[PDB]
Design a protein around this ligand. Sequence first.
Ligand code: HEM
Length: 414
Amino acid sequence: IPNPLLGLDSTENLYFQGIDPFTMFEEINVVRASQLHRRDRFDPVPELHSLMKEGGLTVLGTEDSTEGRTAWLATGIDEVRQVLGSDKFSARLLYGGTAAGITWPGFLTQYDPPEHTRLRRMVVPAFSHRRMQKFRPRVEQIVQDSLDTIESLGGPVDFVPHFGWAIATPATCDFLGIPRDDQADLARILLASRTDRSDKRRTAAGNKFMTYMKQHVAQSRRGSGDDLFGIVGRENGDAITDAELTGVAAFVMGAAADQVARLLAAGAWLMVEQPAQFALLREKPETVPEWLDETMRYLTTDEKTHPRVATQDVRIGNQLVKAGDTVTCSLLAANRPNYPSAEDEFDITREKAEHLAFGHGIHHCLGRAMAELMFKVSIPALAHRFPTLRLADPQREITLGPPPFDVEALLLDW
Ligand code: HEM
């Protein structure tokens, strides 16, 4: 029971007779983790910078009950790696007990070994470095088309739709063999499922997409395409279900496509904030072999991992994480440990900049090679195309939305 006589926070004060206390505990902690992972331009916010100084593992929240659950945040790189690499944490148990089945088939984030291992192993070959090599020429074409469209319009141009989304939509669609004629309507439907203010209309749109995708999966899984479905379906036959394939594909075009768009927008913004450094990339790329890793480290566009649930008591760094506790890992804190300082600042010329922008352990980003391909093609292509790229209005702050790193609009001229 919150006490609204004492405090002002709306989220913490929400109460009505018959409210679920556990739900409120979970939701408040999610809100806290989210607030901590907003950004101050490219930087951690002061609240996270402060929290980081406290130690490598801190309490986000601790339930009203005697012997109730604690939600933890891991910020130290050692603690983050330890939690994410441990077999004593579950991802599945975040969504229900041992009894509860899979809620969203193909949502790998939600599986534990052994079934996480089998499903990921089945879908892995479609996401390989070799497979991305084969995909590069198509990505290069997508990027040039987008730059052509930008140039043809004239500045100012909003790089969120015209760069991030203009690349992410066709790239993710092409990867799944989605016919060119279907892609614009699908992107529109996905927009509605991500943003519509009516939850009812949001669900209708989501269902419309999943219906299309289920049909596409059934059509493609036994055919001869180089799309995800042909590859995985030909290789695995009936061992992978239509629902599992639908789930994987939907993540690629849904959530993951949003991530790529957000990364590309954040990248374009960094280029106009650090033009001398990216001039080095376009004119002498050989002198900056590790530019990609440094950029990923600095940007950390996926600030935090999904909470993991302790399956038994476990020592993390110095603390005791009790069975049933959750730990959320701050990839942002792990990647920016020395913020602020000269050494933390973006430096394109740095030695092999090591980072956890794509996570760690068994759940590490399946699409890392794809995301990297996207970025390694798009950013240099943009730099060469528009060397004079700048903010249309240097006086105006860039508006950032809720995490993950969410550039709402990026008006650039050249
Ligand atoms: C289209 C490109 C992408 C695809 C297809 C993709 C796909 C995936 C999938 C399927 C997972 C779950 C893997 C598992 O649980 O075994 C995952 C995890 C993850 N991805 Fe991506 N991803 C993409 C882009 C990105 C980007 C741009 C970032 C930002 C750096 C990112 C960061 C992460 C992180 C941090 C995790 C681990 C989450 C956790 O441990 O809770 N991904 N990715």
